[PDB]
Amino acid sequence: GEAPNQALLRILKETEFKKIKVLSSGAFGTVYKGLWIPEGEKVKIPVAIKELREATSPKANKEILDEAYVMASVDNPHVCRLLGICLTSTVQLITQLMPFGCLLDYVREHKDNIGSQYLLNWCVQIAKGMNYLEDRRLVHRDLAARNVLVKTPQHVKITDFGLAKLLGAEEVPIKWMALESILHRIYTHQSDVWSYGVTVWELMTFGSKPYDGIPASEISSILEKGERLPQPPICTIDVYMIMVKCWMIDADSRPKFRELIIEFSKMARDPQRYLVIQGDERMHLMDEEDMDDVVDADEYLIP
Ligand SMILES: COc1cc2ncnc(Nc3ccc(F)c(Cl)c3)c2cc1OCCCN1CCOCC1
Numbered sequence: 001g002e003a004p005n006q007a008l009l010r011i012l013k014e015t016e017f018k019k020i021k022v023l024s025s026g027a028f029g030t031v032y033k034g035l036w037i038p039e040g041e042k043v044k045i046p047v048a049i050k051e052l053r054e055a056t057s058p059k060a061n062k063e064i065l066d067e068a069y070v071m072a073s074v075d076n077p078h079v080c081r082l083l084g085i086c087l088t089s090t091v092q093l094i095t096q097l098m099p100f101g102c103l104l105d106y107v108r109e110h111k112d113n114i115g116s117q118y119l120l121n122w123c124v125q126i127a128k129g130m131n132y133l134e135d136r137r138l139v140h141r142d143l144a145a146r147n148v149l150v151k152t153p154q155h156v157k158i159t160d161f162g163l164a165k166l167l168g169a170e171e172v173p174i175k176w177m178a179l180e181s182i183l184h185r186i187y188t189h190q191s192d193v194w195s196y197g198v199t200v201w202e203l204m205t206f207g208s209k210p211y212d213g214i215p216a217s218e219i220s221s222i223l224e225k226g227e228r229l230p231q232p233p234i235c236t237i238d239v240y241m242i243m244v245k246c247w248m249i250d251a252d253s254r255p256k257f258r259e260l261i262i263e264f265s266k267m268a269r270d271p272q273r274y275l276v277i278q279g280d281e282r283m284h285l286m287d288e289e290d291m292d293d294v295v296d297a298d299e300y301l302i303p
Contacts, residue, residue, distance in 0.1 A: 002137075007073045008302075010084030012094060013039065017047065023101075029053045029064075033097060035289070036083070044294045046097035047083060056090045063162060064091050070161040071095065074136060078129030080149065080159040083297060096297035098157065099286065100150035107145070108207035115283040116271035119203055122148070122156045123264040129158035130196060131257035134189045139165045141187060143195035144176050145202040151298075153285040174216040180251060182220045190251040196260065197246030204232040204239065204275070234275050239267070 017036035024031045029052045036045040052064045071082035071093070086092040100106055103122065107114055126148060133140060141163040148156050165171065165187065178194035180186035198210055210229055211219060228247045231240040242263055246254050255263075267274040272281070 005073055009068070009072050009082075012036070012084040012086045012092075014086055014088055015039070016086075017049075017094070019049065023048065028060075034094075036094065038300075042293060043300065044290065045083070045297055045300060046099070046294065047094050047297070048097045049086075050093040050095070052090045052092075054090060061091055064093060066164075067161045068093055070138070070164045074133070074138075076129060076132040077155075077298075078125045078157050079132055080157045095159075096151075098149035098151055098159075100153065102146055103148040103150055103156055104145035104202065104207055106150050107203055110285065111206045113283045113285050114206070114277075115280050116275035116277055117268065118153065118285065119275060120264060120268035120271050121154060122203060123200060124261060124268055125156050126158060126196070126199065127257050127260040127264055129156075130192060131261060133158070133192075134257055137167050139167050139187050139189060140192050140195075141165065142173055142176070143192055143199050144173060145199055145207065148199070151296075174219050175210045177219075178251065179220075179223055179249060182223075188251055189257070190254045193246045193251075193254045193257065193260070196257070197243045198229070200239075200243050201229050201232065204235050204243075208232075234277055236274050236276065239274050 016039050017034055019032045019034050021033045022030060023033055029050060032049045032051070034047045034049050036047045037043070038045065050064070050067075052060055068082055068085050068091070071080065074081055080095055080098070083094045083096060086094060126143075129148075130140070130143065140158070140161070142160060143158070147158065147160040149159050150156055167187075167189065174182060176195045176198045178186075178191035180188075181191050181194075201210060202208065211222070214222070228244060231237075235243075242255070242260075248254050
C-alpha cells in the first residue's frame with residue numbers, strides 16, 4: 001500500500017549558524033544567505049534560510065511546515081532537500097544554498113552564454129527531478145522556471161513545495177496550468193507534465209513570459225480553442241513537438257516524465273541537431289571568513 005515515511009527531521013539551534021545577507025524579501029517572507037555549523041562537527045555549510053513573515057499568524061505557520069514536511073521527505077540530486085528547521089518564533093526553513101539563484105533569473109541574465117548543451121541538460125535534470133517526485137507519489141503544482149534553482153550551471157534542482165500534494169487527496173499560477181486544473185481543480189502528475197512543457201518553453205525562450213500581456217481569466221478560453229505557445233525561434237520541430245505533446249487535452253496522451261528523460265537525454269547527445277543557437281559551440285558558463293572547512297551540503301549526510 002503506502003510505506004512509512006521515515007525521513008529524519010532535524011531541529012537546529014539558533015546558535016548553530018550565522019545569517020549573512022538578504023536574498024529575497026517582500027512576497028510571503030525573507031530568504032537569507034547563511035552559514036551553518038552543525039555544532040560538534042566542525043564543518044561549515046553554505047545554506048539558505050526561508051523565514052516566514054515576521055507577522056507570525058497561525059494561518060501561515062501551517063503552510064511553511066507543510067513545505068518542511070515535503071522538503072524533509074525527498075532525496076534526489078535534482079530536488080532541494082531540507083537540512084533542518086529552527087524554532088525561534090517564526091519557523092526557519094534551512095536548506096542548501098543554491099548560489100547561482102533561480103533558473104529563470106539565470107537564463108534571462110545570461111542569454112548569451114547559454115548553449116544547447118546547457119538548455120538540453122536542464123531539461124533532462126528537471127525531468128529527472130520530477131520523475132522522482134512521481135515515484136514518491138507527489139504532485140508539485142508549480143513547476144516553473146522561477147522554481148528551479150541552480151547549484152552550478154550544470155546542476156539544477158527543483159524546489160518550492162508550498163503547493164505540493166499526495167496524488168488524489170484534498171486540501172494561482174494560471175499560465176502554467178493544465179486544463180483539468182483551471183476548469184476542474186484536477187491534478188495528476190500528468191498535469192505537472194503540462195507545467196514541465198511550459199517550463200521548457202520559458203527556458204527555450206530565454207526567460208520569456210508565457211502568454212505575455214494576455215490577461216489570465218482568458219487563458220481557459222484561448223487554451224480551449226486549441227491554441228498553445230509558439231515554437232521558440234531556437235527550437236527544431238523535434239523539441240517543439242515534445243513541448244506540444246504536454247499540452248494535449250487527454251492527459252494520458254501527455255508523455256510521462258520517464259520518457260521525457262529519455263527523449264531529452266537522447267537529444268542532449270547531439271545538442272546542435274535540436275536547438276539552433278547563434279555561435280553556440282563558442283560558449284561556456286561567493287566567500288569571506290575561513291572556507292577551509294566549508295563543504296557543500298550534497299556531501300553532508302547523516303544516516
Ligand atoms: C542565491 O539565490 C538563491 C539561492 C537559494 N538557495 C536555496 N534555496 C533558496 N530558496 C528557497 C526556496 C524554498 C525554501 F524552502 C528555502 Cl528554505 C529556500 C534560494 C533562493 C535564492 O534566491 C531566489 C531568487 C530571488 N529573486 C531575486 C530578485 O527578486 C525576485 C526573486
